Write a protein that binds this ligand. Structure first.
Ligand SMILES: */C(S)=N/c1ccc(-c2c3ccc(=O)cc-3oc3cc(O)ccc23)c(C(=O)O)c1
Ligand SMILES: */C(S)=N/c1ccc(-c2c3ccc(=O)cc-3oc3cc(O)ccc23)c(C(=O)O)c1
Ligand SMILES: O=C(O)c1cc(/N=C\S)ccc1-c1c2ccc(=O)cc-2oc2cc(O)ccc12
Lengths: 114, 114, 114
């Protein structure tokens, strides 16, 4: 998986170990080796949700395949829970866009996963 | 809808209240309340368009329906107009990628929309 | 094409002229005029790949056509090669998401490409 979180929460409010925790939790949820997991947290953003710049997040979760999608709900509970507990963002001010990529459309190590 | 603008315009030339302006304009364009509108503006970016570092933008509009058909062109007129008038970016140095999301691929508030 | 690189390598490591280099290399690889190419480099990011904060990147290449099995493999060697040589990022710590955009779904200059 590749998980990206864009948030207006400041850098100082992102706990030490947060990328580690995302990685470990994504490994547990997908059941796939953690060595392939990419995580990206982007704090201090100029963002609003519902016209308010209270804490919010816009996220992306990319997975590689064709039959992917069934775990989206489970991921939403997991990831909203992490953003709430760690970054103090209300789950109702988070969107997570899920993208199931074709292997031929993901590059890695000089080629693609096709 | 979720609207994201990445630009090399500096933060100081982003007007005060610009997030609210985007939200309001999208509320009018959609005919739906501001409540579920998310906006994200990213200034100060290292960008080039056409080999030039004159002001430019790369944008995304994600919507669960409410796009396609003649709506993408209408959005482009609205959103290029706003970026030209407020951020002083030439419309010919803006790209906007439109994404018609499936509700099952959008997470929010611990769940997904379908 | 539109090429975006998100990386934890510092801004201070990005060579002067890297945006121009990416623009020219993309032109020659995709066969598209440099005048239409957008590049966006985002350094200093809070990222991990495989649980490690060693240099890594998450990239996107959007194109209206010119995306496919064989083309993407070639692009991956080219783009990993530039990230390795210029930014010192190992190719096995890079993902590139390729998006074949329909012209109807790309806004530009107050309108869309189709
Ligand atoms: C998150 S995106 N986890 C992840 C990343 C890469 C891979 C993986 C492949 C996925 C899908 C494929 O069709 C082929 C894959 O091949 C490899 C090959 C090597 O060497 C490493 C990883 C992948 C997975 C995965 O499911 O295997 C998961
Ligand atoms: C921008 S992304 N505006 C937005 C976001 C979500 C929703 C909305 C749904 C949209 C599409 C669906 O198929 C189902 C939706 O269900 C809900 C349910 C709840 O509780 C809140 C919002 C949505 C809208 C929308 O206009 O309804 C708009
Ligand atoms: O001509 C192209 O293949 C093209 C390539 C681009 N490169 C990266 S995203 C961007 C845009 C276009 C293009 C473009 C691409 C597809 C299409 O159907 C129509 C197009 O029309 C154009 C008109 C113009 O004045 C300028 C460019 C286009």
């Amino acid at each position: 998986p590749m998980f990206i979180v864009n948030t207006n929460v400041p850098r100082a409010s992102v706990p030490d170990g947060f990328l580690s925790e995302l990685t470990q939790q994504l490994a547990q949820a997908t059941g796939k080796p953690p060595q392939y997991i990419a995580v990206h947290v982007v704090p201090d953003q100029l963002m609003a949700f519902g016209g308010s710049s209270e804490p919010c997040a816009l996220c992306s979760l990319h997975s590689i395949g064709k039959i992917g999608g069934a775990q989206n709900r489970s991921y939403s509970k997991l990831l909203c829970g992490l953003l709430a507990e760690r970054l103090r963002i209300s789950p109702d001010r988070v969107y997570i866009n899920y993208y199931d990529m074709n292997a031929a459309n993901v590059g890695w190590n000089n080629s693609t996963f096709a």
